[PDB]
A paper describes a structure:
Neutralizing antibodies target the hemagglutinin (HA), a trimeric protein containing “stem” (also known as the “stalk”) and “head” domains in each protomer. The head domain includes the Receptor Binding Site (RBS), making this domain the primary target of neutralizing antibodies by blocking virus attachment to host cells. The stem domain contains the fusion peptide, which is targeted by a smaller subset of neutralizing antibodies that prevent membrane fusion. Other designs, such as centralized conserved and computationally optimized broadly reactive antigen (COBRA) HA proteins, retain the subtype-specific structural architecture in both domains while seeking to accentuate the conserved features common to circulating strains.
Based on the models built into the cryo-EM maps, the relatively small region of the HA interface with the light chain includes residues 158–160 within antigenic site B. Interestingly, this region encodes for a glycosylation site in a subset of more recent HA sequences, including A/Switzerland/8060/2017, COBRA NG2, A/South Australia/34/2019, and A/Tasmania/503/2020. In both cases, however, the glycan adopts an orientation that points away from the binding interface. This suggests that the glycan can be readily accommodated by both antibodies, though the specific conformation imposed on the carbohydrate chain may impose an entropic cost to binding. The presence of glycosylation at position 158 is correlated with a reduction in affinity in the BLI data for both antibodies, consistent with the steric restrictions imposed by the binding event. The most optimal time period for both of these antibodies corresponds to strains from 2005 to 2012. The introduction of N-linked glycosylation at residue 158 is a major factor in reducing the affinity for these antibodies in some strains after 2014.
Numbering used by the authors:
A (entry chain L), B (entry chain P), C (entry chain K): 2 to 9, 11 to 30, 30A, 30B, 30C, 31 to 95, 95A, 95B, ...
D (entry chain C), E (entry chain A), F (entry chain B): 26 to 316, 389 to 441
G (entry chain Q), H (entry chain J), I (entry chain H): 11 to 31, 31A, 32 to 52, 52A, 53 to 82, 82A, 82B, 82C, ...
Write the structure that this text describes.
Amino acid sequence: SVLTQPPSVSGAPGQRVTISCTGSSSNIGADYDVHWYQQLPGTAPKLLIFGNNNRPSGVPDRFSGSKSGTSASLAITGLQAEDEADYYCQSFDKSLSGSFVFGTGTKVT
Amino acid sequence: SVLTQPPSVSGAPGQRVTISCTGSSSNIGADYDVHWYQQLPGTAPKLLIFGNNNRPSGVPDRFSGSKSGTSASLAITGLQAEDEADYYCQSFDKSLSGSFVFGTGTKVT
Amino acid sequence: SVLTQPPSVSGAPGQRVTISCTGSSSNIGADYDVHWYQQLPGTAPKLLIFGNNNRPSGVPDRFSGSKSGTSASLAITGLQAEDEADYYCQSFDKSLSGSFVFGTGTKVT
Amino acid sequence: VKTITNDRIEVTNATELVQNSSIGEICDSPHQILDGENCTLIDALLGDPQCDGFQNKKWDLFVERSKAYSNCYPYDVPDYASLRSLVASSGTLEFKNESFNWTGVTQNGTSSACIRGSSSSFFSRLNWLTHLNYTYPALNVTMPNNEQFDKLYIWGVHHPGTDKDQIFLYAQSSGRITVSTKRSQQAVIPNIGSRPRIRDIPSRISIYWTIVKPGDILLINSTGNLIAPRGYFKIRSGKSSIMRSDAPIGKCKSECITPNGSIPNDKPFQNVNRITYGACPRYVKQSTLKLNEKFHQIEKEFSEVEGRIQDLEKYVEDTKIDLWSYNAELLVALENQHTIDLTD
Amino acid sequence: VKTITNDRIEVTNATELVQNSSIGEICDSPHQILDGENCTLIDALLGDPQCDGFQNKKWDLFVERSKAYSNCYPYDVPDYASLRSLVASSGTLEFKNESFNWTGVTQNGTSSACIRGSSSSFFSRLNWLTHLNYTYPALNVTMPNNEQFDKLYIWGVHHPGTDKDQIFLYAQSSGRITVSTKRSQQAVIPNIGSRPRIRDIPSRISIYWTIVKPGDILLINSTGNLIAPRGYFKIRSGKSSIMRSDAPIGKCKSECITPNGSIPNDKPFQNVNRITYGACPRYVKQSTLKLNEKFHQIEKEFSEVEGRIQDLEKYVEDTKIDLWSYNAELLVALENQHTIDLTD
Amino acid sequence: VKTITNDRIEVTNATELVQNSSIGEICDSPHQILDGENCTLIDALLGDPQCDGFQNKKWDLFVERSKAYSNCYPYDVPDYASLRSLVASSGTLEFKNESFNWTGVTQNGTSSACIRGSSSSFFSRLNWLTHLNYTYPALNVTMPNNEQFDKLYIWGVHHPGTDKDQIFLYAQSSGRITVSTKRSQQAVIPNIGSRPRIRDIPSRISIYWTIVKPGDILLINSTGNLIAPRGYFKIRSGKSSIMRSDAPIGKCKSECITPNGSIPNDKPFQNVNRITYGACPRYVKQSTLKLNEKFHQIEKEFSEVEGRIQDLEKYVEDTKIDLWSYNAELLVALENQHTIDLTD
Amino acid sequence: VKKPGSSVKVSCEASGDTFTTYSGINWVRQAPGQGLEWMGGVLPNFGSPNYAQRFQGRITITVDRSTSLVHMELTNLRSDDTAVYYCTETGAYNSVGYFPYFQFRGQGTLVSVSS
Amino acid sequence: VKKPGSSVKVSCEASGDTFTTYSGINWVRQAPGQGLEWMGGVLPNFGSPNYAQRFQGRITITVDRSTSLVHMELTNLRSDDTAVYYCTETGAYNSVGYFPYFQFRGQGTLVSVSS
Amino acid sequence: VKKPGSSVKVSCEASGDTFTTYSGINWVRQAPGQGLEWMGGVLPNFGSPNYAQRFQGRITITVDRSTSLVHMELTNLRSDDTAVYYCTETGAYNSVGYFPYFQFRGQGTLVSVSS
Ligand SMILES: *[C@@H]1O[C@H](CO)[C@@H](O[C@@H]2O[C@H](CO)[C@@H](O[C@@H]3O[C@H](CO)[C@@H](O)[C@H](O[C@H]4O[C@H](CO)[C@@H](O)[C@H](O)[C@@H]4O)[C@@H]3O)[C@H](O)[C@H]2NC(C)=O)[C@H](O)[C@H]1NC(C)=O
Ligand SMILES: *[C@@H]1O[C@H](CO)[C@@H](O[C@@H]2O[C@H](CO)[C@@H](O[C@@H]3O[C@H](CO)[C@@H](O)[C@H](O[C@H]4O[C@H](CO)[C@@H](O)[C@H](O)[C@@H]4O)[C@@H]3O)[C@H](O)[C@H]2NC(C)=O)[C@H](O)[C@H]1NC(C)=O
Ligand SMILES: *[C@@H]1O[C@H](CO)[C@@H](O[C@@H]2O[C@H](CO)[C@@H](O[C@@H]3O[C@H](CO)[C@@H](O)[C@H](O[C@H]4O[C@H](CO)[C@@H](O)[C@H](O)[C@@H]4O)[C@@H]3O)[C@H](O)[C@H]2NC(C)=O)[C@H](O)[C@H]1NC(C)=O
Ligand SMILES: *[C@@H]1O[C@H](CO[C@@H]2O[C@@H](C)[C@@H](O)[C@@H](O)[C@@H]2O)[C@@H](O[C@@H]2O[C@H](CO)[C@@H](O)[C@H](O)[C@H]2NC(C)=O)[C@H](O)[C@H]1NC(C)=O
Ligand SMILES: *[C@@H]1O[C@H](CO[C@@H]2O[C@@H](C)[C@@H](O)[C@@H](O)[C@@H]2O)[C@@H](O[C@@H]2O[C@H](CO)[C@@H](O)[C@H](O)[C@H]2NC(C)=O)[C@H](O)[C@H]1NC(C)=O
Ligand SMILES: *[C@@H]1O[C@H](CO[C@@H]2O[C@@H](C)[C@@H](O)[C@@H](O)[C@@H]2O)[C@@H](O[C@@H]2O[C@H](CO)[C@@H](O)[C@H](O)[C@H]2NC(C)=O)[C@H](O)[C@H]1NC(C)=O
Ligand SMILES: *[C@@H]1O[C@H](CO)[C@@H](O[C@@H]2O[C@H](CO)[C@@H](O)[C@H](O)[C@H]2NC(C)=O)[C@H](O)[C@H]1NC(C)=O
Ligand SMILES: *[C@@H]1O[C@H](CO)[C@@H](O[C@@H]2O[C@H](CO)[C@@H](O)[C@H](O)[C@H]2NC(C)=O)[C@H](O)[C@H]1NC(C)=O
Ligand SMILES: *[C@@H]1O[C@H](CO)[C@@H](O)[C@H](O)[C@H]1NC(C)=O
């Protein structure tokens, strides 16, 4: 089980860019939050967002998240040079024996 | 004792529409919340909003409410076909022996 | 120790006007809130904002405040005739023996 | 008869020193007897509708029947035995009304589980304060003791079954009570939760008491769930006590009351019961011996297992009984011996 | 020998009325003896892995060794002495399983600090309920008592060391437990905080018990931190008790058990120990005098200072000892005198 | 004189076996007497400014005067009697300072209601921790017991009168205290509320104590409202006790101290008072009879009604008195009889 | 159709999934083509019924605990009393100006008065 | 007008409707045409007065509990000390970077220093 | 490089500044140029290891309490198992749909399977 994600997005620096994570009736749609992870190329994935709006210490306020219905959205207020990493969305699937589900991944350019 | 309400409002579907409930120094103005009820023609009135922003289960997020001073406002983000019902606003009047006061009613078109 | 503030600001009535209080790593930047005081000419200074967004009873909602990083901002939604007073920003400085620090003051016109 | 030198000596005449039977009734005189009927002492204190005849009464001995039952709002009393013993030792139910302010709230609440006439009612000595126009302001009420005697106050806290009920009665979901005097303080927080239904009511009430000395002041600071007092009881000291018995009340005279009727107090020892009131003979285990005025005492029968405290009480009473039985035996032996010696 | 008239009278023959020595072993008969080995009574009640052999056993006297130790999850019991005395007086560890629903949560939690075989385990008589798929719904579970006897239930609350641990086990940071019956209620709130580590575990568990009468119903309403019961113990009344002793168990017969082995019960007085079980002679301070069946009693030795209650217990036992020593002395004197008189 | 055979026998000479009068002073020898003056034992323990002369002192008997009063911050002690008895039995006020870290907070708070010199002060043995630059971080402080003896720690919690005061002292409105050892835990939550003013102060302080065994560790985890300890008291066991009396201290010798001065201990019985210290005669109700070393004991006089516990204590003492009065009477009778017989 | 001067009684069930011990029952009136009006209310397990001042003397509220019902009777009917009557259950929520909201159960009852 | 080198004492009442047991009193100075400056403060029922480092040695704060007053004295006055002095009471609020706010009571006191 | 059909064991330390009594350890796999996948997890002080259904029968998780380590072994390796493996620690936060988040510690371990 995986969560659908856009293959890649792109845009000029200095404007808002949006990424989406769509779920099912078992994940996100079953009253489960979504976590966002960041992976710069050649490095282990980091933690970006949890609880759909909480940012850990060491993350700029440029990143925002939201969840509605069976979908979730990630937003960056201002695109910068260091935003070359990949983004993943994580949720919990209650179906069968239960598992942790990750998105298909996205590339920001 | 009644709360003043516009007789009717109208507009094309797909845009925001606003309804207002104006009170006195005894209701709304005396630190009392406002409830919003919905009545489709030929049916018993239903419950739409309570606590000035709380929506019960089974109501779309298109409906919003607010209160300021001695007045209250109801808002619909997107007008649809099923929004043919009437809307009432309810508060509590502390004057005399106390009672429940309802608005004059409004018609959305 | 003092907090930097613009000497004066001016504008026509009826639009938003902004005042700023910039701090250091010891005040505002050391997890300390900012208070805003108002002083009409020929009168003792009053209290306008505390806790960066709290308004005491008797203050219109036209005044707003915010804090970000090591800086703070005061905003007035609508300029009026009675807004002829001076504004001060107050914080706490943890350096040395600790003290209460005030801004340099501003004049609104 | 038994003697120290010889265990079996035959004599021309002998008398019995142990009372083994009872009349079967309570003599009603000279002690003042108050029959509780269907009411317990705590129910009469709180003002149960079926106990309205016990108001402002006085007693020397209070009789509790096993047929007693409660017919009002469900309640529990932490340290029930201490309050029961205190009220029994006080010996009076005299009540004096006081005018507390209680401004901003509704007074005289009634419940369907407490029926006095044909309508809903409540405890007569307690005040159920609720919301007024769906608001409940904080209460800061004081009452000074300018008299020369102590005052006893009975108050309570209300535990609803759900949060909905909490809001429906008090308009807010966070209540707290603090009752204090210059030398004491009591803080109680309600516990919202579901409980087994008694008379269709899942909620409960907890009862607390406070004593105010002369020259002191009583302060109550509450935000909800408060069962206010209507006044104070006069608490004194005397020879009063409480007894559990099913014996009928008669018309006779006897200075010794046992659970099983009144017994004659001419012989120095008895074996009918270890629970006694008034001038009574000592209790011994011996059923036959051939030749003291205590009033309030400790509880000597228990219907529930409690542990340490009840074990200590039982141990104390067992020690007393055994030592007095030894005393009785030795005394009888000695007297018999000396009499035999003086007659030869 | 000593007499009332003369303190020193020489006689041809005399006997000793005080037992001063012990066999050194517990006779194992006729009373039913249960040797606890490395296990305490509470550990055997809860189901410690090393105490699995004590399940459903019965005893007349329970022997606790000083070598006993705990090898499971750390815990504490408020009013430990009361529960210990209750279980000791009950005299049986018989357990009956009941099918509680417990829907929406995970069952049979295990800890690394409680090792039964080669894997993690827990108490055998307790159920550790945790989150199910990172959710913990509110529990509203009932169990009626349709039998003719009382039921004893043992449950617990869990106190984590941090808020992280709270969330990691229960998925929410606000737990509350309410256990009620038609005549009782108990509300417990966990206290999150750091505590010294025992077997690498900083968390603790508090143990509570509830008794249900026939015709009553048990209700449990919880939102987290609940250590559920798997059933009930049958609680009865009898001559059972508990004793602390390091004496080995032998094979003999004696109706009197002392901490220091079994002692002969032919003489009327003894001085070996104030703690006795069965038909035993009275304890006196006198070490030499020249010429009763109690079962469960109070605790007479304390390892911690507690204050008021322990002082009262010591005072009671001291009074008893002194009065019985006086009785012994007077009796011996009298008997000696009368015998001298009757032989002249 | 009285005899078993005859109640009235005339004899040439007789002696009195009951002491009925007192000297009126406390002899100050051989027992070590510590006069409390205006100070109570708890006030001397906490470090009241007027009790600064009692620091590190030792006693065999502590004398409390009715003129004693408090002149510091208002406070109350849950289980006051237990702590008072513990300190009295310990028999010493020796104090040893320890260096707790207490990093991130302000130390040595002072109050205007506690005046030592001309300036504000506080209890000498307690530390009032407050905010530092309007911040109050969580405290995680430990202290191990590496000695061969037990340690006694006295700490407290502060209850402000309002939420404003809470914030004004601790910078946050939610405080909690947890003091734990490997075998114990104590969780205290402050109760904010208004209380009657003593020395213009409506707030109160609650006092708690903790005992640490050798090889154990003390852990304190707090977020506010903490009255920290400055060290530990050495707690031992001995013949020390406490007595309430207004008799002046003299210069004599007597092994028996009564509330009403010292009394001669030559006669075997007395009737002056039931409260005794040292080698004293037995207390009897008889005022005239014509022909034991206990140290700490239970409390025998009460100024407040408490119920069950106080009733049990009174019952115990009444039983003791009655049995010893019977013993006295019987003994006197027997001795008189035997003497008459041996003189004829 | 009820004759003028007669009485009309509307019954309601004080039970359900959302009904608790201290829930209340309120009556609401709606004239044909007009707004909503509030009439008396009662808590079946607490206190006494409240009444609106416009209906004082003509209205009575009774609680039947055996059948767990609540009835409202209106004496001396008039032509203007032709309307539809609704039962409402009280709702609870955490606020600072909180007052109960109305939960309409079922459809209304039509009452017409004519000679 | 005070002579240079003299002393000036400003008194303030430590009582009122909003004043509690542990409320504090702070002194604020304002030169004519300049900003606000903070001087010493004291809690009348707790601790010892605090002082600003610019005024060390010249300022003293005393609490009079019989009249429920608090006084601040400034020794060795100077020409630059001409200013208006204000009393402030401390306010409390729930936050995470909380520090007391100042509540100005009454009008200020004008002090002028000249030879 | 591991031969097909062999076993690979990845060890991890169940200790650190943020690690508590009931923290958990989860394993994550990432194929070269692909997304993230979840493998088994275990709490070292509670319960039994959980496993993903895709890896049932081939994976085992062991806890070594003496060295405070946790190991995951994968039996019967295959060519598609070439990937980088990461340890994650569980995080806690207050919510209503809360599920633990993953804290990646250190860099991953590269495992390649070839004949
Ligand atoms: C937590 O659990 C307890 C235990 O289940 C629960 O209390 C129960 O509430 C129900 C009400 O929903 C009670 O059921 C009633 O019992 C009485 C007997 O005393 C019956 O007479 C009642 O009959 C009514 O309902 C019937 C339904 O078919 C109708 O046919 C009939 O005509 C009546 O209208 C009713 O069944 C039950 O007795 C208690 N259990 C107790 C007190 O032990 C409690 O509500 C739960 N907490 C929650 C849900 O928050
Ligand atoms: C509140 O304070 C208490 C007291 O400090 C604190 O509890 C302490 O936690 C630490 C863990 O951080 C414990 O330290 C361990 O002690 C055991 C002995 O029992 C050692 O074997 C452990 O060794 C490990 O760590 C070493 C570090 O160099 C390694 O070298 C070694 O290989 C092991 O990995 C470890 O030191 C300490 O014993 C307790 N103190 C107690 C229980 O009294 C508690 O965590 C604090 N609360 C917080 C922080 O929330
Ligand atoms: C809850 O209620 C209690 C009880 O009312 C309340 O405590 C009271 O506070 C007031 C202060 O507002 C106290 O009044 C003082 O009493 C002393 C005597 O001890 C007087 O000397 C004081 O006199 C001052 O005020 C006078 C006003 O005219 C002045 O003229 C005078 O010069 C002094 O400045 C003052 O009256 C009162 O004693 C207590 N009551 C007690 C302790 O029982 C408490 O504040 C309330 N809680 C709140 C409001 O949060
Ligand atoms: C809502 O409040 C009214 C008004 O209560 C009165 O005014 C308040 C300011 C306060 O002073 C109260 O003590 C007064 O009673 C309530 O109407 C009163 O109800 C009581 C109860 O029967 C009656 O004795 C009074 O006469 C009524 N007052 C008037 C002016 O008629 C009313 O009951 C409240 N409604 C609720 C609590 O639902
Ligand atoms: C605000 O804090 C200052 C600084 O406190 C010092 O620095 C801290 C980091 C910590 O290490 C404290 O223990 C230090 O004392 C306080 O100024 C100190 O006040 C005390 C009290 O008289 C004095 O002994 C120190 O010398 C002072 N430190 C210096 C550098 O002068 C100040 O009192 C605090 N203000 C408050 C609490 O209102
Ligand atoms: C997440 O939940 C699954 C499913 O649990 C089952 O379905 C629930 C609706 C409820 O009915 C439970 O009682 C069921 O067990 C858990 O998978 C189960 O795990 C247990 C434990 O070994 C096992 O006995 C069951 O067979 C499993 N169920 C299935 C369908 O395989 C799973 O463990 C949970 N994950 C957690 C709690 O992390
Ligand atoms: C007591 O039991 C009831 C019933 O299980 C619990 O009530 C539920 O509470 C949750 C949380 O607020 C609500 O979402 C449910 O709707 C409630 N159910 C009902 C039927 O009211 C209650 O929480 C329990 N109380 C405790 C302390 O555990
Ligand atoms: C027990 O002690 C611990 C450690 O000092 C406290 O944990 C801290 O709590 C604060 C407030 O939530 C956090 O910001 C810190 O990160 C925590 N530290 C650690 C190491 O976890 C805890 O608050 C204390 N508990 C009590 C009741 O005082
Ligand atoms: C009760 O309090 C109000 C305001 O708190 C006051 O106006 C009224 O006088 C008080 N009652 C009496 C009898 O004084």
